Amino acid sequence: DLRLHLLLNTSVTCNDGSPAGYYLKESRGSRRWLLFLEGGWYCFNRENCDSRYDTMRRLMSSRDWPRTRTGTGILSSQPEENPYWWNANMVFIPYCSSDVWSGASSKSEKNEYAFMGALIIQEVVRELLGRGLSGAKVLLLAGSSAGGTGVLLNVDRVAEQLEKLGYPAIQVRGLADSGWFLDNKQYRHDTTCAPTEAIRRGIRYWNGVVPERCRRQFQEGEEWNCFFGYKVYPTLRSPVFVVQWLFDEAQLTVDNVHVQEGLRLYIQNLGRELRHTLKDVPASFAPACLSHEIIIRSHWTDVQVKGTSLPRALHCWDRSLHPLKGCPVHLVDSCPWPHCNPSCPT
Numbered sequence: 001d002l003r004l005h006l007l008l009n010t011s012v013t014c015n016d017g018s019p020a021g022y023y024l025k026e027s028r029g030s031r032r033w034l035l036f037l038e039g040g041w042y043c044f045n046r047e048n049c050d051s052r053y054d055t056m057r058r059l060m061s062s063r064d065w066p067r068t069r070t071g072t073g074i075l076s077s078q079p080e081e082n083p084y085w086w087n088a089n090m091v092f093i094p095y096c097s098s099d100v101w102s103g104a105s106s107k108s109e110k111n112e113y114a115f116m117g118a119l120i121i122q123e124v125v126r127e128l129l130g131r132g133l134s135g136a137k138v139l140l141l142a143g144s145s146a147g148g149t150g151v152l153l154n155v156d157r158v159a160e161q162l163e164k165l166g167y168p169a170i171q172v173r174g175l176a177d178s179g180w181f182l183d184n185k186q187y188r189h190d191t192t193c194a195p196t197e198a199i200r201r202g203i204r205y206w207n208g209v210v211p212e213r214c215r216r217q218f219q220e221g222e223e224w225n226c227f228f229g230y231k232v233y234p235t236l237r238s239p240v241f242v243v244q245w246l247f248d249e250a251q252l253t254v255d256n257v258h259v260q261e262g263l264r265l266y267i268q269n270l271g272r273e274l275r276h277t278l279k280d281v282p283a284s285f286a287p288a289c290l291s292h293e294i295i296i297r298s299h300w301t302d303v304q305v306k307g308t309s310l311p312r313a314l315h316c317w318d319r320s321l322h323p324l325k326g327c328p329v330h331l332v333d334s335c336p337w338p339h340c341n342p343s344c345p346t
């Protein structure tokens, strides 16, 4: 199990002002650290954040968190479940800021909620340095869904933080799972609000922050563009592996898709567009399945692209950062319909 630690800097808080935190299982014989960002949508005004507080309160507060959590999938310490990184130091960072890990704003006389996602990540890294992270060789920042987008927004800031603190030997890398979204036209078109507009509003409500080079390209008012992987990825310096189902269920939900010719062409076009955005991403795993998230699921070892599993692809990525014979790192399905790959989750 992983053990809960609430942040010692109690000014870095969840939405309701309670302290944020992290769950940790150390591996004394290892110089590898995995920091995983949880997902879970977002909220972008008082009314919809109030509703989330009623029925999704563990995503806005630490008051009810359990003292332990079981590591699963890539966070498992058993080689049978985790062929990739079973011996690493494992960290699970709960998502309690509702801001896609972008916010830097405290609760105050003018703010009912705090949105501190970007500051939570930096404070976890700071406090871990005293618990062994100072001796690391590789820090892999990973995440699923909103946590995958959070990797894209924060991986270069973690790298800069450690450089400025005097640790240039720690190699920071990113693993983004199910957080590579398209700002496409909906199939059919209040919280009717497409993600482009919801994120435009959220950035102001959260005091949201994006990576510097992407900010300089898009400029004031247009920072929402940096929440979309195909736009922010080319600006990043750290190595990032992208895991993305071609027919992601959250993407279909925001597209108002719940089969005749019109919808068939829509779905096929979505898969082709996603494939096109990955054509020049050298480390990626993108199967032709209707699903959502994978890396902390117990059965993450089952899916394969071109005969290669995800744990194998990640191991090949590790070797490439030391092409490899029979050890590929770019794996994108070409068949055009969900479940055309027989290994898709059932």
Ligand SMILES: *[C@@H]1O[C@H](CO)[C@@H](O)[C@H](O)[C@H]1NC(C)=O
Pocket (backbone or CB within 6 Å): 009, 011, 012, 119, 123
């Ligand atoms: C606590 O965190 C805040 C917000 O990131 C920061 O401004 C402050 O310097 C931190 N203080 C300590 C003692 O870590």
Ligand SMILES: Oc1c(F)cc(F)cc1-c1cc[nH]n1
Pocket (backbone or CB within 6 Å): 040, 041, 042, 100, 145, 146, 149, 181, 182, 195, 196, 199, 227, 228, 250, 254
């Ligand atoms: O975080 C997102 C983002 F930045 C852009 C987008 F289109 C969708 C999401 C999303 C959907 C479910 N969780 N997160």
